[PDB]
Design a protein around this ligand. Structure first.
Ligand SMILES: O=C(O)c1ccc(NC(=O)[C@@H]2[C@@H](c3ccccc3)CCN2C(=O)/C=C/c2cc(Cl)ccc2-n2cnnn2)cc1
Length: 238
């Protein structure tokens, strides 16, 4: 996260850190708990991931330093990538991780509500992007989970800023015209959480942008409301 501050413990209890084991253990992506055996993340996170066996999901983490060989994690049973997904910039950047065991909800880890299909018309004024990503384009993964409040941008405005791209209604953009606050390397897959009527909703999934926090370059997120049916299809299969 660029231009963000340290989170307080338990502030974003749906936020997870997805680690890869191969070649060595390190943070790969962010993700969100949406169900007791479900993580919602970005499909691009799994470029070169040939098996779920190399993945470990950590919940209830504030600092990456809490993660050692003795730290409990959830194994991944299945990686479900949207079947229209080609690349982040083309859209359909969404994936589900089905966990091998059930998440026990508590004050440190609990799910985030999906947006309501009825809330396609709401104007979110309180949105936050969180992650352990870089603070600038040439940096390193951060120890403490960072947060940054970002304003949502209309599709029309975002399209003006991404000449040469097609910004679809399945994408949602966020950022300040002057830049300064945004997601960056290592934040992808994580949530864009918006508070509406005192309830937090998973409005976006950190996906892509041209650089980090640049002037007139908003961050591009998967527009979760447009994927509620796909999420229910995959999580509620008979
Ligand atoms: O340990 C590390 O050094 C370490 C180093 C980088 C990453 N991750 C990343 O760069 C991941 C990449 C990835 C992850 C997994 C598999 C394959 C591809 C794809 C891009 N990406 C982001 O995080 C996207 C960032 C991004 C998002 C928004 Cl909304 C705005 C601006 C952004 N940026 C523009 N230019 N940079 N950030 C993770 C870890």
């Amino acid at each position: 996260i660029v231009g963000g501050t340290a989170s307080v413990r338990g502030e974003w209890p749906w936020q997870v850190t997805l680690h890869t084991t191969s070649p060595t253990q390190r943070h790969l992506c962010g993700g969100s708990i949406i169900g007791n055996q479900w993580i919602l993340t970005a499909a691009h996170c799994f470029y070169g991931v040939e098996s779920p066996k190399i993945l470990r999901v950590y919940s209830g983490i504030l600092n990456q330093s809490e993660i050692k060989e003795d730290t409990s994690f959830f194994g991944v049973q299945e990686i479900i990538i949207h079947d229209q997904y080609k690349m982040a910039e083309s859209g359909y950047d969404i994936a589900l991780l089905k966990l091998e065991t059930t998440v026990g909800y508590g004050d440190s880890q609990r799910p985030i509500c999906l947006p309501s299909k009825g809330d396609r018309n709401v104007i979110y004024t309180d949105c936050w992007v969180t992650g352990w990503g870089y603070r600038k384009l040439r940096d390193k993964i951060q120890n403490t989970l960072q947060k940054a409040k970002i304003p949502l941008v209309t599709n029309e405005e975002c399209q003006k800023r991404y000449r040469g791209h097609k910004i679809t209604h399945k994408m949602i953009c966020a950022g300040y015209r002057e830049g300064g606050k945004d997601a960056c390397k290592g934040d992808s897959g994580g949530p864009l959480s918006c508070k509406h009527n005192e309830v937090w909703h998973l409005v976006g999934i950190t996906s892509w942008g041209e650089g980090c926090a640049q002037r007139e370059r908003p961050g591009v997120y998967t527009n979760v409301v447009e994927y509620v049916d796909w999420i229910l299809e995959k999580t509620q299969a008979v």
